[PDB]
C-alpha cells in the first residue's frame, strides 16, 4: 500500500523538486539492484513468484514514477539519471519477470514510453508472457488481492468540484505529464 | 459452538474420529454394512480380475488423493498378477493398492493372520479362502467380510 502511495505521490505532486524525485528513483533502483543481486538465485528454487510480491510492488512504483516524470530523468547531456536505460532492461529480463506480475495497464504504459525513449524494450517479453498464458506460478487465492492492491492509486484525480480546483496548483493531471 | 475453546473440544475430544472403540468393552462401533459386505465378498473373490483400465479406475475413484492424505503426491500401483497372455490385476490387489496409498510410506505394511465368516468348503476343494492373510500390507489370501 505504501509503495502504491509512494509511486502515486511522486508522480502527481506538482510542488516536488527535481532532486526530491531523483531521490526516490535513486532509492528504488538502488533497493531494486540489491534485490536482484541477492535474490535472483531463489527463483529456480522451491516456492512461487509470490515470494517476491515486494519486488514487483517496488518495481511498479518505479515504473509508474517513470511514466509521469521520464522527461525529468534526462540530465543536461541527454543521459539518464540512475542509468535508467541500462537499469530497466536488466529487471525486465531478470528471472522475476516483473512485466508478468505487476499491474497490466502500467506495465503496458511503461513499455510504450520506455520503448519510445530508447530506455527499454519489453514488448517481446510481453508477447511471450500472454502466449505462455494461452497455452512462475502463483496461487490466485492470494494472487488477486495483489492485483487489487496494484490497481489502486491513492492520488489518481479527484472528483469533488471545489477541492479539485483547490488542488490544481498541487496536481499534475496525466495530460500535463 | 461459538468460540475457539469449544471448537478445540469438538475437534479433539468429542469428535467422531477417535471414537472407533466403545468404552463399554473396547470394541469397534464403526464399520460398513449391507451392499458393502456383499460387494467385498465379490470383489475379493479369486474369480475377480481387472484390466489395467479398470484397476486404475477403481483406485482413483476411491482414493481421493486430492486430500489431507497426500501420503504421496503421486498414486502408486502394483504390477499385474498375470503378465501374459493379457495384463490382469486381482481384487485382492485393489485392496493392497488402497492400503499402499493411504498408510504411511515411512512405515512397513500391516501383518495380519485372521479369519472370515465363510468356511473353505464353500469355495471348493483345497480352498484356503477362509484364512485372511496380510503380509507386508498385501492381501495374499482370503476374502474380506463383515468380520
Amino acid at each position: 500500500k505504501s509503495l502504491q502511495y509512494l509511486g502515486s505521490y511522486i508522480a502527481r505532486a506538482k510542488k516536488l523538486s527535481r532532486t526530491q524525485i531523483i531521490f526516490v528513483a535513486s532509492y528504488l533502483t538502488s533497493w531494486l539492484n540489491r534485490y536482484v543481486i541477492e535474490r535472483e538465485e531463489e527463483v529456480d528454487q522451491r516456492g512461487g513468484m509470490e515470494r517476491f510480491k515486494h519486488f514487483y510492488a517496488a518495481f511498479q512504483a518505479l515504473c509508474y514514477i517513470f511514466c509521469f516524470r521520464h522527461n525529468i530523468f534526462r540530465d543536461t547531456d541527454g543521459n539518464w539519471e540512475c542509468e535508467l536505460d541500462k537499469f530497466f532492461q536488466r529487471m525486465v529480463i531478470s528471472k522475476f519477470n516483473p512485466l508478468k506480475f505487476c499491474n497490466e495497464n502500467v506495465m503496458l504504459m511503461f513499455a510504450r514510453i520506455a520503448q519510445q525513449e530508447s530506455v527499454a524494450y519489453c514488448f517481446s517479453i510481453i508477447e511471450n508472457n500472454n502466449n505462455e498464458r494461452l497455452r512462475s506460478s502463483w496461487s490466485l487465492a492470494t494472487r488477486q488481492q495483489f492485483i487489487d492492491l496494484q490497481s489502486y492509486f491513492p492520488y489518481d484525480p479527484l472528483f469533488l468540484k471545489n477541492y479539485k480546483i483547490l488542488m490544481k496548483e498541487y496536481y499534475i493531471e496525466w495530460s500535463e505529464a | 459452538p461459538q468460540n475457539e475453546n469449544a471448537r478445540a473440544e469438538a475437534l479433539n475430544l468429542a469428535n467422531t474420529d477417535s471414537q472407533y472403540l466403545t468404552p463399554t468393552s473396547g470394541s469397534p462401533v464403526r464399520g460398513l454394512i449391507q451392499d458393502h459386505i456383499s460387494a467385498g465378498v465379490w470383489l475379493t473373490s479369486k474369480d475377480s480380475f481387472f484390466t489395467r483400465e479398470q484397476y486404475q479406475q477403481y483406485i482413483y475413484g476411491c482414493i481421493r488423493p486430492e486430500d489431507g492424505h497426500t501420503t504421496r503426491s503421486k498414486i502408486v500401483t502394483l504390477p499385474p498378477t498375470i503378465f501374459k497372455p493379457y495384463p490382469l490385476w486381482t481384487g485382492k490387489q485393489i485392496i493392497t493398492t488402497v492400503l499402499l496409498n493411504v498408510t504411511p510410506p515411512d512405515m512397513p505394511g500391516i501383518n495380519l493372520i485372521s479369519k472370515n465368516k465363510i468356511k473353505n468348503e464353500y469355495w471348493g476343494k483345497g480352498s484356503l479362502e477362509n484364512e485372511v492373510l496380510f503380509k507386508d500390507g498385501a492381501l495374499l489370501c482370503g476374502i474380506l467380510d463383515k468380520s
Binding site: - | 475379493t44 473373490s45 479369486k46 474369480d47 475377480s48 480380475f49 489395467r52 504390477p79 499385474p80 498378477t81 498375470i82 503378465f83 501374459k84 497372455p85 493379457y86 495384463p87 490382469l88 490385476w89 486381482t90 481384487g91 485382492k92 490387489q93 464353500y122 469355495w123 471348493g124 476343494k125 483345497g126 480352498s127 484356503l128 492373510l133 503380509k135 498385501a138 492381501l139 495374499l140 489370501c141
Partner: protein, 131 residues
C-alpha cells in the same frame, strides 16, 4: 534368471464355485515326489485333465508398463504368465519341502525334494506356463 522348471501332468481341474478360475492338481513327469496345486484364470488359459504343462518359476524376465515397439522378454517363450509372491515355506518331511505362492489371490502350492527346489526363495517371482 530361471529358478525352476518341470513338465507337469494335470490330474484334476476343479472349477469350484467360480467360472473363470480353476484349481489344478498336477504331478511332475520327471520327479516322483514333485507335485503342484495352482489356481488359473482358465478363461485366458483353458486346461483339461491329462494336459501336459511346462511350468517355470523365474526371478525376472530377460517396472511394468504396457508392451511397446519391439519389447522382448522371457514371457515370449510361453502362453500364460503370472506375477506373485512367495509367502510361506514348510518342511513336509525329512526329505521334502513345499513353497506357497500367491498371485493376487490365485494360490500355488509346489511340493518337491529340497534339492530340486533349492533356488526358490521367499521373494517375488514370475510364473510361466506353456502347453
Amino acid at each position: 534368471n530361471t529358478l525352476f522348471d518341470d513338465i507337469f501332468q494335470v490330474s484334476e481341474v476343479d472349477p469350484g464355485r467360480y467360472n473363470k478360475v480353476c484349481r489344478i492338481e498336477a504331478a511332475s513327469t520327471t520327479q516322483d515326489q514333485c507335485k503342484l496345486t495352482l489356481d488359473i484364470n482358465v478363461e485366458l488359459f483353458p486346461v483339461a485333465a491329462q494336459d501336459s504343462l511346462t511350468v517355470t518359476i523365474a526371478s525376472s524376465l530377460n517396472s511394468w508398463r504396457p508392451p511397446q515397439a519391439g519389447d522382448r522378454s522371457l514371457a515370449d517363450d510361453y502362453d500364460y504368465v503370472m506375477y506373485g509372491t512367495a509367502y510361506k515355506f514348510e518342511e513336509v518331511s525329512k526329505d521334502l519341502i513345499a513353497v506357497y505362492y500367491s498371485f493376487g489371490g490365485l494360490l500355488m502350492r509346489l511340493e518337491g525334494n529340497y534339492r530340486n527346489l533349492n533356488n526358490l526363495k521367499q521373494e517375488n517371482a514370475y510364473l510361466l506356463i506353456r502347453r
